[PDB]
Amino acid sequence: SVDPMTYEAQFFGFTPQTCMLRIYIAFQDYLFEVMQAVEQVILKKLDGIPDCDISPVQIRKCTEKFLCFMKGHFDNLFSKMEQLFLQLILRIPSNILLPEDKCKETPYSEEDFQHLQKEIEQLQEKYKTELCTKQALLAELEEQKIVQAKLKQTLTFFDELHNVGRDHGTSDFRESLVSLVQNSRKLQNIRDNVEKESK
Amino acid sequence: MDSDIKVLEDQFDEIIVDIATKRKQYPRKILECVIKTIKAKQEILKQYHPVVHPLDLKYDPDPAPHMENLKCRGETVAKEISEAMKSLPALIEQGEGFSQV
Amino acid sequence: SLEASVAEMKEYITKFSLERQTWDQLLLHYQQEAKEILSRGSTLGSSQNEVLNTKPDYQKILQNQSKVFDCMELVMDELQGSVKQLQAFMDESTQCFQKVS
């Protein structure tokens, strides 16, 4: 029991039961209206009696009788008609989903949702590290240019040294040394022969 | 009951239509807000793109004031051992010229 | 049973009360969140961490150059000594070989 019809509201915006109450009090008021009409119409025609008179207090409770009958049948029939109203009108079939909340048709679970939030934060952090390591790599390469050019400078100095050796006659020192020790050895030998034939 | 049930059912109807109004039109306003806040967050994220850490430092160059000085002494020793290699075998010829008579 | 029905109704009133309260709280939450994030803007385990952690010392490299040149300098000192030791012998050799008269 006690159906609040929460989903039947939000669409209509009034709830069906309250609406049926308004309709009830209106219908009842109209029934009592036409009964008041017939009583005050028979009473004025009732003044057109000569010879004899018939009391109005009797006709009042006469109307009260017909009206109690009318409230029995009226009330019952309005209950049945009102339950038909709540069944086939003023009801979301429970099969139907409102266009207001279509995104809830495939609901995103609490766990998928929290998972996706954590993923979002952790991807913000991941972006934040990737950018500064971009800057770290780029900075290391710009720094690396300098040592590359300095080593090219020392290599330039060695090539310039072999150039300054090439000019002035001795491009390869090692060869010069091995020939100069060779002919130094010969000169030593022949020098000893000349000093030992010198006396 | 009676009058009490009418007051209670009245406030109950009020809370039903109220919570239904919330259920309907609140997710749209909240959605508007969170769309603003998400655009704002992803916008302030890109403002961090200039991280710019300097790094750098270096041992700098100690250039070539003396580099040309040792290359110049290299010219000196180069020419010296060249002319020595040219003048020594002549002394070998003077050497074996005296080895017979 | 009127008692059971009015009971369920008097529980629903409080349930929907708590839900309305939660809706208002939540909505104003996202509201002031958007307000503060929109008013806030005005006023290292990354990919390839090995590449970042593998960083050879370049300063020590430039230092090693500065001492390489020193080694080279004493190399040419030893050379420039050996040359003198040689043509000293050449001079005494040519002198004693002209002493043959």
């Binding site: 006690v2 009592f32 009260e64 009206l67 009330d75 | 059912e9 | 029905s5």
Partner: peptide, 13 residues
């Protein structure tokens, strides 16, 4: 005359 039934509870058994 009135004396009409007032009430008609909306959501009850």
């Amino acid at each position: 005359l009135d004396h009409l039934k007032n009430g008609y509870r909306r959501r009850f058994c």
